[PDB]
Symmetry: D2
Subunit: 447 residues, 4 copies
């Protein structure tokens, strides 16, 4: 059968193909070919711009324009042409070289130097730079924008429910109260940490020949400083330079990128699960469009896809940086999967965002539950007792802990405490015993 969303083996291109359309122009073979073209064209352009390389004279504005067009207008038909050529070359990078030669055949100035396309390059010089451009593009145009949406989403929830009290759950049971907003704030803060880290990860690239020593370049042009050339070229692409490599770029930075994405994903899994739980406890209800139950399907879909994402991201991170001697070819096929781990993540991010838009706190339920857990006030009573030197505080409260407002008031009135403090204690309720929760939500914007 022909390939369609219905027949695709993987749901990344199948059932969820529409959800990851942005990656089709980045991590697919079309994306790979698009960036290989960009790299090769820029390489030829630098050769021309370099005065010491006389065989490739400087390009005029028009010539530079024709080349820039080949790069900026690269279409599916162009990629299809490269694939056609590959049926004969049986070498994908070679297919791109021939493709560019065809595109330039009509321009005498460009056709005159067409044999300098890919000059002294090894296939990996082109490939690793293509991979870096794909990852950088994915990060700046896709991943970070979704992360900001999730972060702003959580912060919107934190602010909206900043003062909604919540009977906390430690080891699944009633504990010292907090507020819904504060619990959302905690997540936003963690996400922000990973956001800053992902944004600071270096995206590396190299260009130095067959095994990393510019052997071929120096043989042809011994007077040219190819080390300087390499650094200038990589940096001109908006990529950070990796001066020491073998035939391949080592891939350590890919592990760095994927490790931070995985950490963020883990935070989201934690969030999806906690929300699923709050819904199970009836703390959230369906947002108005009698309380209606909200189906957590969106958080479960996200959770499921986040697990798949980390599994793939994790594998590439740990396997890619291991390559026999000056390199084995196992990374070639593996690197065609850079967008798979990211694809699972994108599907999950959209699902969580969808689920978040359906959340509405069930204030009445939250408050009613709190009013049935006066045992939580044992904590504040103990610290006040301890402050005033009352002996065996924990022991006394243990004996005290059925507990209700009246039972607590009577216990407090019987304590050896100044009247002012007794009133302060008799003034608290599980619902208002939330500490600094609200102010902490308000301060999130300062971090």
């Amino acid at each position: 059968m022909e390939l369609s969303s219905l027949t695709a083996v993987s749901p990344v291109d199948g059932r969820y193909g529409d959800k990851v359309s942005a990656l089709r122009g980045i991590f697919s073979e079309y994306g790979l070919l698009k960036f290989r073209v960009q790299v090769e064209v820029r390489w030829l352009q630098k050769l021309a711009a370099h005065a010491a390389i006389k065989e490739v004279p400087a390009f005029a504005a028009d010539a530079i324009g024709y080349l820039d067009a080949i790069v900026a207008s690269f279409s599916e038909e162009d990629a299809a042409r490269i694939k056609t050529i590959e049926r004969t070359t049986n070498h994908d990078v070679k297919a791109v070289e021939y493709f560019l030669k065809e595109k330039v055949a009509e321009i005498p100035e460009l056709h005159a130097v067409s044999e300098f396309i890919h000059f002294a390059c090894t296939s990996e010089d082109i490939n690793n730079l293509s991979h870096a451009l794909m990852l950088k593009t994915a990060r700046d145009e896709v991943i970070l924008p979704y992360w900001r949406q999730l972060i702003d989403g959580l912060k919107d929830l934190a602010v909206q429910y900043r003062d909604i009290p919540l009977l906390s759950r430690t080891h699944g049971q009633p504990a010292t109260p907090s507020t819904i907003g504060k619990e959302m704030a905690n997540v936003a803060y963690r996400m922000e940490r990973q956001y800053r880290q992902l944004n600071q990860v270096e995206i590396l690239g190299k260009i130095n020949g067959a095994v990393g020593n510019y052997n071929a370049h120096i043989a042809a042009y011994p007077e040219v400083d190819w080390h300087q050339f390499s650094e200038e070229f990589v940096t001109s692409l908006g990529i950070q330079w990796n001066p020491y490599t073998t035939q391949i770029e080592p891939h350590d930075y890919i592990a760095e990128l994927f490790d931070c994405v995985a950490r963020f994903n883990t935070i989201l899994i934690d969030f999806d699960r906690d929300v699923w739980g709050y819904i199970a406890l009836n703390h959230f209800k369906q947002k108005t469009i009698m309380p209606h139950k909200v189906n957590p399907i969106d958080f479960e879909n996200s959770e499921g896809n986040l697990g798949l994402s980390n599994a793939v991201l994790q594998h590439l991170a740990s396997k890619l940086p291991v390559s026999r001697w000056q390199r084995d070819l196992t990374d070639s096929t593996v690197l065609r999967n850079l967008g798979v781990g990211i694809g699972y993540a994108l599907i999950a991010y959209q699902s969580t965002l969808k689920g978040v838009s359906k959340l509405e706190v069930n204030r009445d339920h939250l408050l009613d539950e709190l009013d049935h857990n006066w045992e939580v006030l044992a904590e504040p009573i103990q610290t006040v007792m301890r402050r005033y030197g009352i002996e065996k505080p924990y022991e006394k409260l243990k004996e005290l802990t059925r507990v209700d407002a009246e039972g607590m008031k009577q216990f407090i009135d019987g304590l050896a405490l100044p009247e002012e403090e007794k009133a302060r204690l008799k003034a608290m309720t599980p619902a208002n015993y939330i500490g600094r929760a609200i102010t902490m939500v308000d301060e999130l914007k300062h971090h």
Copy 2:
């Protein structure tokens, strides 16, 4: 951009889409929908066949024929119709129910009982059975046939090179000789063990309602033995019955299937790596189509894809069997990836088979290397010395170990051994000191 092999994010449907075409009819959404239809149709058919369920009278041969046709002729257009219906139902299983009702609307006998389609079923009753059929189909029609091809491939190599001596490598260095064939035989044997295990894995299915107790069935038909009904139905599909489940089939058997596939994959990774190594040592050369080097690209492609396969298979195996209480929905989206792990494996199996067809032993190199490692004969000399009570054998050989034929002959002649034994030792060479290697290759067919 539209989905095509060029734009697909995942190479399973992208660059390697053609290599996994067999899975398009099994694990894709089309495959999922095809089996859901089979399940629903058979369920209706059993209801009709059951005399106690009067509301659904027995079907005549013609009616049964119309239904069997819906199942056997299920096309992409049918799946596309289900998807169209899903845009309105927003429920995939519900979409199948409506699809079947439409297909039967024209047949009065079938249309008369159309409301019994999916009777008392929960979505998972249909889904888990669809998953079992997909896995069973994949196993019997795709995975095992590739495994047999690899096994026969290794056995063909074992027999062909049964008597080609090899200087073994332990901790990467020269060791007691074996033969190329014997080393291939070792792999075939291990593969066979996993083949038998995969073939013995139970493929489970269930059908028992919302949470596994036939609540709905018993409510409508309290006189029918739904426990017996369930067992008969599942077994009639060629699936093994799982009597105790919650809303979902627990998925333990999926882990069992995937664990055996992963073990086989690990054996193949070991094989791909060893062959890559033998090629590096120049023990293999390009098969005739002066020795020509064989490029190990096929084994490297296999190795890379096997790592991805295990990562996915591993994740599903460990995550699927964990479902909150009577079930959470995280497995729904994850189960759409049953064919992803298998897809990576298939790509690898084909790559290894391709690589194997290019192998030719470099007999001259193997023999020359052996003739330069006479140190290996220290071992047989020591055991013979030990057999005849010659003291400090290891110490004496240590002092002896440059070593060549003449040096060994002289050492042997100076030993306190019966003449007959001295000749036996002086008759061995690294090339013929291969023990029982050849006979063991010949005996593989007995195991």
Copy 3:
């Protein structure tokens, strides 16, 4: 600092050292040395018993007795002696050979053949057999007994609470009822499947020299059938024979053993989490020693340790079977960790057993919750409506779904159903709408 439970880096020997004392005699270096001694002694014994090997005459009953004593009485002091000897040999297997020679030096009949200890053996011949004995011992004497305890524990809970109704939870929300016992039964059934599988896993061993071809054996005794000898020897130890290996036993069976242990562990993780959840919902309370909350700490400790266990078991399963060419030495140090993954599991098994002994159902809470979820009866009403041809059943119930007994009774009375069926429907309550749950618990003993 010296090693003690307090200073141990790993909690397996540290905080939880007492919990895994059984493994100290199996997987530790003492255990490793104990089994190496057993293997070597039995090897010498078979050499003596073999008439064709004249240099080692048959042992008299007394001699056999002295040897059996060395094996059965192996003490920590003996192991300490081997370690002392290892300081000089810098080879652990060699240290055992010398140790045995010392032990036999006083017995003339044994000392006369002391140089045949380890005859023709390579270190791995001894090591792999030691590993098999350690795993077999651990399985039959430790792992399976704990599994049976857990299984019987779950079955005791299933029977005790066979008829305690439970409002099921699907995607964390109210669903068709079941009983506590049935939910426990589901777990017991899954555990039993893994128990049978673990018990059926083959524990393999080999003995065939440096690289697996009996080279050294044949060189010394060409008239002896060493292939038959090997099979008889391995099987005599109670181990299954692996005829085809390199220098090492491939380790596939270890992956098979660990994969089944991991599957069982995953089922237990699922159980620990679900119980943690039931406790959170107040379905369980502290068993009598007003309902008292039970702290789930035991299930959480189990859950945590099960994750660590699988991580270790998983790593050994996937890494051990990969060994470069005729073997690399990475498995030597890794195989010293066979008991680590098992140790984490044992700690968890004991924790879950401890937690289970504290469970008591909170019947009043379970029943009260059910009585507040009459929406669950929409399901049985729909199937009965469907059975009698009442149109748009789902649509009508949707409009109907606040819901209480009276609301349902009125809806049912207004249905076009025979009086007998209306009464059957009006007779059900969420508490009694449990389907076949109870009978299924009673039938568990038949599977």
Copy 4:
């Protein structure tokens, strides 16, 4: 049996216990208890130093001295006392509180405020800070020093063999030459990147009560700024402040630390494997103490332990940051394993360092192999041909590629190239065709 290095289940405390002695004072229960004491003592000290907390007056120099002594002199006997107390409290943190009260009972000034020990703290306030101190200590005193040793080790090899030519291996076969030193340099560079990253990882800590809102603190002292107090306290310990948490510190930073350690470990695995390979190819020989083979056992031991390390580190990194609601207790037992992953790493680091000290290049072998692979000069000949516009360079060389010096000289002399260039090409040999390799080794010190 009692615990000893011989009976320990785990080799981290068993066979390799001596190799990780440094961790016994950090990650063991003794280490955990030592830091809990430090935390509690400092907390009491800050309470005293805070003027607003009148109930705990400022401590005099002598009192502060007595407290500092309890912290700095914490011994195994002290830890043993805490364990003894724990037999009664059945709560480890509570045991520390009682222990400190006993230690201060004799000092009236301290005993007078002894009830303020642990004031308003929840167990995790103490535990998370203890974990941060353990990780920071391990990083600065143990991990980084080993990393520097490995880095300096590789850099020493790079410089020593800076000009030793090497026939590179891509896909295991001959490729463009490099030098041994350059290949060592590549590793050093990668290690340095991870070193800088590990050193920049934030080590976080928190202190804010039961669920993170200072509820208890504010209840007792509403006039004190506990948010400021928390930040000052954590930072005073040399730890970075994490303002937003639940009952537990989220553990994201632990994943960050472990991810960087794992990346470094992966680089080392790559190094261990490559060296194992170079040894297999006879490029390295035993350093003088005729070429003697060096046994790679040290690199294999390192490789094996690095795999175990990553498996453990990986599990904690992905599992720790997931905690149900305000926290579940699964992290408590898991956090007792912080030193296990690190322990496996330390064993490996020492093994690689040991192996490195045995390496000596086999210059004669390296040069002889190069002199038999003149095919590598096809590359430089092609780029020079391309520079001068000679058509079909690749095609011509293909036809040319047996190849020796004479064959190349004749091919070059027949080319349409200026005489000067022909001589430059005829002047190269595989041994001197190393590009910029040497200069790149010399420049490593600048990065």
